[PDB]
Specification:
The structure is cut from a larger assembly and holds chains A (135 residues), B (94 residues), C (109 residues), D (71 residues) and E (38 residues).
Chain A lengths: L30 E5 L3 E4 H14 L5 E4 L5 E5 L12 E9 L4 E6 L3 H11 L7 E5 L3
Antiparallel strand pairs in A: 1-6, 1-7, 2-5, 3-6, 4-5
Helix pairs in contact in A: 1-2
Chain B lengths: L2 E3 L1 E2 L5 H9 L2 E7 L6 E6 H7 L10 E5 L2 E12 L6 E8 L1
Parallel strand pairs in B: 1-5, 3-7
Antiparallel strand pairs in B: 2-4, 3-4, 5-6, 6-7
Chain C lengths: L3 H16 L3 E4 L8 H13 L1 E4 L7 H4 L17 E4 L8 H9 L8
Antiparallel strand pairs in C: 1-3, 2-3
The complex binds magnesium ion (2 copies) and zinc ion (ZN).
The site of zinc ion has 8 residues of chain E, from loops.
Chain D binds one RNA strand of 81 nucleotides through helix 2.
PDB class: ribosome
Keywords: mRNA, tRNA, helicase, ribosome
Entry title: E. coli pH03H9 complex
Chain lengths: 135, 94, 109, 71, 38
RNA sequence: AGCCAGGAUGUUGGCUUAGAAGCAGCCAUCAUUUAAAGAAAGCGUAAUAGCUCACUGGUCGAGUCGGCCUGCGCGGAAGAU
């Protein structure tokens, strides 16, 4: 459901996911959920994890999403021959490098943040871990 | 308060640095002021267990190297991304 | 939980009362209900009795102020003490009540 | 044999229903002139020899109704 | 029992026992907790 | 960690309570006695009740508890001569 409201272009090349991540220090809240694996996340996965976190703290607290997709995935339909043009877009993804902080939370106890993030970690295709506020 | 025992990097570069990290040491460097900077290899688990204390980022830190005792303060740190460990520290002279 | 300063603190709270004691009761309390406790607490200050239930191994630190080591080695089993601070008697009598009134323990001291 | 404390706030406090809003909105305020007399008359089945013992004990029960202590 | 790939202690009286190289979960209170192929 | 023992009062905490007494539940979650008793962790209850635990004393006497970095393992794992 998280989706760019307008884009410069329709499509994008496939590209690669080589290297490590930037958004590494916990910079907004008290607790953070960080990627360990390497891959890509859909908007459905991001929204479902957000719903899991907001379920666990029920409403209260403030939650940051440090990621946003801004990359489409083109998908040729069922039973279309190869070639004849690049396919249409059906879902948007975010590029994930390891060490990327994904989610961030402030205003709750540590054990509650810890269990909320382990609820949302099963919603995700990769291994994720728990980080605190640092310097 | 804090006193850090340390050796001297005789080789520098990423090959020696990654050998040194895999040998459960890690490098750092002291700079700032009038002297030419000083590069240090030092033990990992010691300072990794030090730095969780909040006083580590506030107080003045003494370091033993060559017998010489140097008073510094911590400035910035290259933390590793996903494991809970460290790579490199920038220390500032007093 | 229980600080070492807390364990020091209970000793320092009880030892000056032991210094300001006349006689005391070292009993057995193997099973006493809350409603069997609260009226006895009432009768405590109501006759001027200062009663405590301590860590029973932790008494000789405060008791070691001789002349109060008198019946020292009576820590076996759960015990409790009741000091009297005015007119000795009228505190031990309060348990000489219950020794035949609650159909239970013979008091050890 | 002693009357409950939940029903005594319908004859000496001012409210006639219950709370509604325990810590979202205050309805009224309770001073110490209303409860010391009742605590004095209720010295038949209480816990505590000092009057100070049940003083804050009877006051602290009524606090979860959106009432303001006045002392 | 129930044979799920991931087993959990479910109450106070649940218990983890390895038997024949297979993980089993036994409860003394509730018979629903009984699990295998952990 | 076992074992002996306790583990209350106000108190059915207010309530849309059909009926809620920690007892699905919305709110805060505070006071006596002490060594402690969560105005409550969870099975039961027509609603109660009755049996545990978080806590405290004694008996016994040397280690004990689950977090991290890791090498190697286990389950997950069912096809057709
Ligand atoms: Mg190279
Ligand atoms: Mg096999
Ligand atoms: Zn069980």
């Amino acid at each position: 459901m998280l989706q760019p409201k307008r884009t410069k272009f329709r499509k994008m090349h496939k590209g690669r996911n080589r290297g490590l991540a930037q958004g590494t220090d916990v910079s907004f809240g008290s607790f953070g959920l960080k990627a360990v694996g390497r891959g890509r996340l859909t908007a459905r996965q991001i929204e479902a994890a957000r719903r899991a976190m907001t379920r666990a703290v029920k409403r209260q607290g403030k939650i940051w999403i440090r990621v946003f997709p801004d990359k489409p995935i083109t998908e040729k339909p069922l039973a279309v021959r190869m070639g004849k043009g690049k396919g249409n877009v059906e879902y948007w993804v975010a590029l994930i490098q390891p060490g990327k902080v994904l989610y961030e939370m402030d205003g709750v106890p540590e054990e509650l943040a810890r269990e909320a993030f382990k609820l949302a970690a099963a919603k995700l295709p990769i291994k994720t871990t728990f980080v605190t506020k640092t310097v | 308060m804090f006193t850090i025992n340390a050796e001297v990097r005789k080789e520098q570069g990423k090959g020696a640095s990654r050998r040194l990290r895999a040998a459960n040491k890690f490098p750092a460097i002291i700079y700032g002021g009038k002297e030419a900077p000083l590069a240090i290899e030092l033990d990992h688990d010691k300072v990794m267990n030090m730095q969780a204390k909040a006083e580590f980022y506030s107080e003045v830190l003494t370091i033993v190297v060559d017998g010489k005792e140097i008073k510094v303060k911590a400035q910035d740190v290259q933390r590793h991304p996903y494991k809970p460990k460290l790579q490199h520290i920038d220390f500032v002279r007093a | 939980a229980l600080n070492l300063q807390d364990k020091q603190a209970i000793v320092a709270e009880v030892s000056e009362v032991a210094k300001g004691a006349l006689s005391a009761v070292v009993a057995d309390s193997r099973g006493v209900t809350v409603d069997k406790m609260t009226e006895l607490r009432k009768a405590g200050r109501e006759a001027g009795v200062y009663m405590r239930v301590v860590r029973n191994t932790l008494l000789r630190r405060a008791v070691e102020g001789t002349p109060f080591e008198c019946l020292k080695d009576a820590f076996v089993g759960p015990t409790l003490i009741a000091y009297s601070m005015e007119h000795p008697g009228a505190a031990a009598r309060l348990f000489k009540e219950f020794a035949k009134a609650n159909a239970k323990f013979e008091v050890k001291a | 044999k002693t009357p409950p404390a939940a029903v005594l706030l319908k004859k000496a406090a001012g409210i006639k229903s219950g709370s509604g809003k325990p810590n979202k909105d205050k309805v009224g305020k309770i001073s110490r002139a209303q409860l010391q007399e009742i605590a004095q008359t209720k010295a038949a089945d209480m816990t505590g020899a000092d009057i100070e013992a049940m003083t804050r004990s009877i006051e602290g029960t009524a606090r979860s109704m959106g009432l303001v202590v006045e002392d | 029992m129930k044979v799920r790939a991931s087993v959990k202690k479910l109450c106070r009286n649940c218990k983890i026992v390895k038997r024949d190289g297979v993980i089993r979960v036994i409860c003394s209170a509730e018979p629903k907790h009984k699990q295998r192929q952990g």
